[PDB]
Specification:
This protein is an alpha+beta fold. It has a single domain (about 1-95), classed as Colicin E5 C-terminal ribonuclease domain (CRD) (YaeB-like fold). Helix content is about 15%, strand content about 30%. It is globular, with a radius of gyration of 13 Å. Keywords: Antibiotic, Antimicrobial, Bacteriocin, Endonuclease, Hydrolase, Nuclease, Plasmid.
Length: about 100
């Protein structure tokens, strides 16, 4: 644990967004920093088309995070580390409470 799967859309975004595989691995293994969800209608989950409505965990920091589906281990989002003005997904609940 955790997972990890990275779909081809995310792999394509990685060098555009400042991520290497190692950065991903390291960010994730440093531990949970927040919580989100992987909520995707069936049409949006090729090739299986089953849909996701799963809890997700956030790893890394604001502007520099990856979001991981807790059931599947799929990475669902990566921020653009390379954009000092990246707008964090407002839906993430950071830290605890």
């Amino acid at each position: 644990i955790p997972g990890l799967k990275i779909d081809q859309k995310i792999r394509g975004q990685m060098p555009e967004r400042g991520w290497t595989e190692d950065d991903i691995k390291n960010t994730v293994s440093n531990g949970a920093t927040g919580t989100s969800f992987d909520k995707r209608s069936p049409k949006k989950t090729p090739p299986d088309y089953l849909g996701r409505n799963d809890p997700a965990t956030v790893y890394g920091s604001p502007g520099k995070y990856v979001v991981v589906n807790d059931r599947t281990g799929e990475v669902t989002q990566i921020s653009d580390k390379t954009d000092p003005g990246w707008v964090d997904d407002s839906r993430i609940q950071w830290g605890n409470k």
